[PDB]
Amino acid sequence: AHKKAAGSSRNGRDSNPKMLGVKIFGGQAIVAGNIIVRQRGTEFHAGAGVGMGRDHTLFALNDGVVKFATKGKFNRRYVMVEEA
Amino acid sequence: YTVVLTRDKARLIEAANDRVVAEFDTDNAKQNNMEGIPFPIDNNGLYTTGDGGSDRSANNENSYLKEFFNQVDKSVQELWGEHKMPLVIVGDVRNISYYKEVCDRPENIIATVSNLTELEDGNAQRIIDGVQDAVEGYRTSLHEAALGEIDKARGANALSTDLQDVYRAAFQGAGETLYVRRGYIQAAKVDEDAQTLTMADAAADGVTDDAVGLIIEHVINNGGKAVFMPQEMMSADQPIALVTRY
Amino acid sequence: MLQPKRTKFRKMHKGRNTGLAHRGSTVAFGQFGLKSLTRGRMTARQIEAARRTITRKIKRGGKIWIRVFPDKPISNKPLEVRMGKGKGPVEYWVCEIKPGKMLYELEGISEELAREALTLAAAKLPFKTTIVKRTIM
Amino acid sequence: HFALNAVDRSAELQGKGASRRLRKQNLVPAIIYGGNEEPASISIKINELVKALEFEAFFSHILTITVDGVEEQAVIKALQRHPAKGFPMHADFQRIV
RNA sequence: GCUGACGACCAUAGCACGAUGGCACCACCUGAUCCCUUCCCGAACUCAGAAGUGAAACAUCGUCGCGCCAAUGGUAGUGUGGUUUCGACCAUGUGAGAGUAGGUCAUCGUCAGCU
RNA sequence: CGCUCAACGGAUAAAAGGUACUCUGGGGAUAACAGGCUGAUACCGCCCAAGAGUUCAUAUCGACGGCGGUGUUUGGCACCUCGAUGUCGGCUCAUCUCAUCCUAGGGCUGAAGCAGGUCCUAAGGGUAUGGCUGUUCGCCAUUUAAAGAGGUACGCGAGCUGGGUUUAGAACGUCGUGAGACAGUUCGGUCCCUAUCUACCGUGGGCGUUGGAAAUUUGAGAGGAUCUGCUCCUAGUACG
């Protein structure tokens, strides 16, 4: 192993996937209880008709059509369920 | 340079005469930006540890040693190109012979020393001590090689050997190299106004005690070299010889 | 031997040097540059070999700019080492060069001695270079 | 020195493929914007533009572009050249008023 | 015409600088008995009020100094088919980011009050 | 409620080793030899020119760097072979390459001559015997015009050998409680095959060659061979 410069560097572990992201995209029909976004933190915020879980999960409080918009003074990404 | 060769390792010692200047450790800092293996170089080839392939029955031990010394010579050359000193090779007979087979610049080798002891645990000074006979043999060879320079000067009519001639030539800056027999002292009546070096009688009349030391000083002053040639290479009757610049 | 003083991470992914040098492709500091016509890796030993050569030609009469810094560590596996067992140690630092990038610029020196010095620098470089004058636009 | 000739560049001579195919005919795309009206797209011959670019006063004086008829007083605002080859690839001219 | 409340929108709305406003409204403001306050403090909160003042704050107006927004053109990338010296190129369809010309001292809704 | 059941879908409540005394079933799915791919490394060459060369980069050498060629070292891979492709060295017998060791022809030279140094051309021949060690090698002795570098399954064990490596015995040092182990050492230790085909070396039979026969022959072509020392004279002249 001339120059002898190699050697073990133990960093060969990782965690399992979490399957996060948008589950139902804009303009889709949705029923109450359907999960819309699984996320870490509030990447998207719960608008009218959308609830927020302890996991930060966004779900439909009532049936309708899911809609995405950037609203508010913070330019936050909101998800709403419009009664349509 | 002292290259210390074994079948197990290689060391590199840089030395000035009887003392060691450095040992080329891993904290030497002339080794910082190296692309070869730095000294001390462990022989960690595949066969030494048992991994890889080619088990003992193939009898590739000689070729493994030859390639290991080739890598050692690569490191030696990469350090030599930056400071270009001559090198002495120290090791077993077969080790230094394998090294001479493989060396990329074998004209920079001055001597090999095969009877040196304690090549792995030994002190750097200890090895330098054991190379002294070879270092003096090389210094003697470097004086035997000056005989041909003296003959070249003589044949080109650029060699002055009379004491007065050498004084004049060294004083007016014409002396390129001075060759003085060991221990040669001469007293003479010197006056540089007329540049007349007449022989002294008793060295008690106002003469210069070391008329040849004055020559040596003038030749060194005018950017020349002085070579002090031993008594058995230089003639007793012609004890001085100056290679002139014209 | 240029090298970053400290890095965020020891090792790097190989990457893919592609595209043209749309930035760092004009003579910006000196009055006279040497840009590249080919791509490749410019190691830190070629930086100091081309930089030492230009310094000896300008002889404390000009100013040299080095528009190329090696900040990408290249690992190398030693001999007698199988594949795997990790990622090899870092041995040198290259800078990624694209066609268009200047490598050196000069200023304050006869245009003949500047051409004669950038010509001598290209000899130590792995690139097909060319000689370019600083312009307005 | 400060007068150059140009040809109108139609909407079928615009875009990535058309500009690449137009440069193969030794023509340089260019746009004339500014003033108080919409920008006009023109095309300059490479050899005339290269010659005009050598004059160092070309960049700091009022230029004249005669597009086979209608004539415009312009100033060169931007000039993108080839990163490696160095030849001009597009010229920005600002209409002066 | 202006003021206040609550919204839409979330910098072309912001920042900065200057000017205007006290009849209403607002704000400072007076006082600390009372309700209620302070790990101390009537600062904030709370109350009882109208001597003073638009000083601050606030609102409105003005501007391009900053910030913000932002083309046209070109370039980079790229789906598909083909070619290639493997860098890229051609056909077709897309097409940025940066930068430039330029724009910007917002724009509306409900209700109440003075005019 | 009781798990480092942490080998974390947890085999049992409960568990280490050695084998060169070994054995069976399999694998070229997977190592050791050789081939193949690759060429990092190695070797060789070229580019630049800091310098060394008393002066002078380029007679000679080429720092820092750059670009290739070869398959040639040390490697990487696991593609072929595990219903077997015998390991190193020696002997015998070779065949090829040229990056030429000698001899041959040259240019430059820091080439006076004699001797060299480099580089070009050149593969026709030639290119030792020994001491030591199993050695290839290497050191050494004495020669030689010279004692070339390589490929050929690191050419060649159905051609020989069997010194080393690498079975079973035994011992030392060392490691192990031990059975045992050691690219540590030491003493000892079965090398089969009557050649079918190809190839090659020789030597015949058959038929053909425009009727047959006895002789003599031409030569399309093929092979062999190709080395070199020393002495004298020119002339102790040229040169010095």
Next chain:
RNA sequence: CCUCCUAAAGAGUAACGGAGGAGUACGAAGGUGCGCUCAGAACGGUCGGAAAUCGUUCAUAGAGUAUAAAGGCAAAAGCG
């Protein structure tokens, strides 16, 4: 087992690939109601300074979030 990248802008995605953490803690560090806003820099001030505590001016988080990292956090998820 968790976090980032590899991972090719949905998910997922391997290597003896590159980097780090976990095998807990807390009856308040949970719930609710109410209230609050940080890090720094400069100026002034006894000990006292570069920095303790106090006062002033800027100060969308350059802080904090029990615990790595990522994503979040003003209606604060931060602090009483």
Next chain:
RNA sequence: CGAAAGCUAUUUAGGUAGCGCCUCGGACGAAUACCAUUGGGGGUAGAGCACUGUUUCGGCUAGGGGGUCAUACCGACUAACCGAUGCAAACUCCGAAUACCGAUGAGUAAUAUCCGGGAGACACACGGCGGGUGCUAACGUCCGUCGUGGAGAGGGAAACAACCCAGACCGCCAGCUAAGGCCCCAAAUUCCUAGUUAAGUGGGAAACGAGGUGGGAAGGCAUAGACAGCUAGGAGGUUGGCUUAGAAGCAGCCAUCCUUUAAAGAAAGCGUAAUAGCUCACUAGUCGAGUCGGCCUGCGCGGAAGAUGUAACGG
């Protein structure tokens, strides 16, 4: 009719099991696919420094690097922040194309889905594309994605599972084409037009070198005699100063001055130890018509050495 060499788990890694993929039957019937228009979220390619770092140059300074008397209070004087400029998998002020998830709508289609009987497979390989690893090495390895092979014949690539064209039900002494080709081996042009090459380049190989050859944009000079040749001169302060043994145009460092001039460098080379000496630049003369040097583009040249035999167009 027709796979798989995948995911998960496993004392598992060449075994096996669930799911994925195949077949058979049943149910269901457009719920499926392609395309057009349209609703979405993204942080990749690219890009860029606004964050985290890294990086170069300049300006600018509290801290630092140094020098008389001077514990004389330590006195006189010599990192940042701004502006240009790059880079990053674990950076992002930005940001596609595709891909994915939906909606609506035509046309075309032996669809999609569910339930049950029977499996096989869980050693994959190469060629692209995007990467990690390796050396942007490997007929290497590990992922993603597509095509082919596997399990696929036919034509082309000389021969050549994986490349290109193309999917063999059988038969025909019929025709048209694809990739590839048309001088002969060997079917089809010694076909036509305009050029390039002189290297058998074509029909291996780079940095680098050269006055090959063709073309294109510009230029400088020229019958006020251009380029080359030949003739004559090429000088005086002065051996510029310094340094150096010597430095006299020509080791090296600092200027590039003046004079007779038609012209002549405080010199572009050779030479000398230093001088000397020979050239050159430059000018005048002679002759007489075009000429000189850079840039870009095409095709060539050298660089180019191996082992059984030409042996690097199949011939």
